[PDB]
Design a protein around this ligand. Structure first.
Ligand SMILES: Nc1ncnc2c1ncn2[C@@H]1O[C@H](CSCC[C@H](N)C(=O)O)[C@@H](O)[C@H]1O
Ligand SMILES: Nc1ncnc2c1ncn2[C@@H]1O[C@H](CSCC[C@H](N)C(=O)O)[C@@H](O)[C@H]1O
Lengths: 159, 159
């Protein structure tokens, strides 16, 4: 499968957007606490996030716990410090588990995570006119790059 | 070049995100009024959009005006009602002008626009668990699909 991992996300609208993209694709959502916001059920529903119930979601109290519970698979780390493009790897094997790990809107990923995993750090190409892309936009780009390579498994090409 | 055209966008954060992706790539931003928010220079500064100045932006009072001022190029219309994938077309020619036209967060694209241009209506594939993707996410996906096909011209220069 395809997986998005959010390391300590900050801003509720970004995670709401990412959860929508996950519901839209069958991508799993992994949230590493602390979060910057509540995800209580009654609040999500009155906020009209009806799609949230359809997301395959897992919460973790630490990135250590995340790793322990997700030992198998291919792990990629999205960071502007990466020296490979997000499109440089093959995500076409539907039977594999691909994990794309994203940093905080403000802090990004911890430096040691980037350093320990540098040959799997991916930079979406940019001009020098911004420091970074929006978190939810980067998750949407990576999700649909993987699904493009897999020829859209489980998705409706037409209504 | 690559162009994103927003038909009467509603939510300031979506247009802020799309402007960020445009500054990040050199994609032109075309805004068809009425907009749902102020884009006065003083409001954008109050909102902290430091990259806005770098965006190649044009405003129009109508889609008719937009068409009159952009006669040459290839026009694609992003809608869940499309019957071709966003990846089904060739955007690889850097000398051509590719325009991707997006609808409103609430009403989408006008029915007559979809009908009249149906052969070039593009649907990003989705499951049945959501009605649509987030507007800014869809723009980011299309921008980076076009730049992928062109091998990221003008990006990652002198990082
Ligand atoms: N160009 C890009 N390439 C890869 N990931 C990106 C990206 N822009 C944003 N992201 C992702 O979005 C997250 C939040 S943006 C954080 C940016 C960072 N704090 C800075 O120095 O500006 C990042 O941690 C990364 O996972
Ligand atoms: N799956 C998808 N394929 C193509 N465009 C999409 C899309 N999801 C969202 N969009 C774009 O994002 C815009 C705003 S989403 C608006 C849709 C409307 N609220 C509804 O319930 O259906 C759309 O007009 C379209 O341009």
């Amino acid at each position: 499968g395809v997986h998005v991992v959010l390391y300590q996300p900050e801003i509720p609208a970004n995670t709401g957007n990412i959860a929508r993209t996950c519901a839209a694709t069958g991508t799993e959502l992994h949230l590493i606490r602390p979060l910057g916001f509540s995800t209580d059920d009654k609040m999500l529903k009155r906020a009209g996030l009806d799609y949230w119930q359809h997301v395959k979601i897992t919460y973790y109290d630490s990135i250590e716990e995340f790793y322990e519970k997700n030992k198998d698979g291919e792990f990629f780390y999205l960071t502007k410090y990466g020296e490979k493009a997000h499109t440089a790897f093959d995500y076409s094997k539907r039977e594999k588990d691909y994990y794309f790990v994203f940093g905080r809107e403000t802090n990004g990923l911890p430096a040691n995570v980037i350093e320990e995993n540098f040959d799997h750090c991916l930079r979406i190409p940019m001009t020098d006119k911004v420091r970074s892309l929006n978190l939810s936009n980067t998750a949407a780009i990576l999700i649909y790059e993987a699904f493009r390579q897999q020829n859209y498994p489980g998705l409706d090409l037409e209504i």
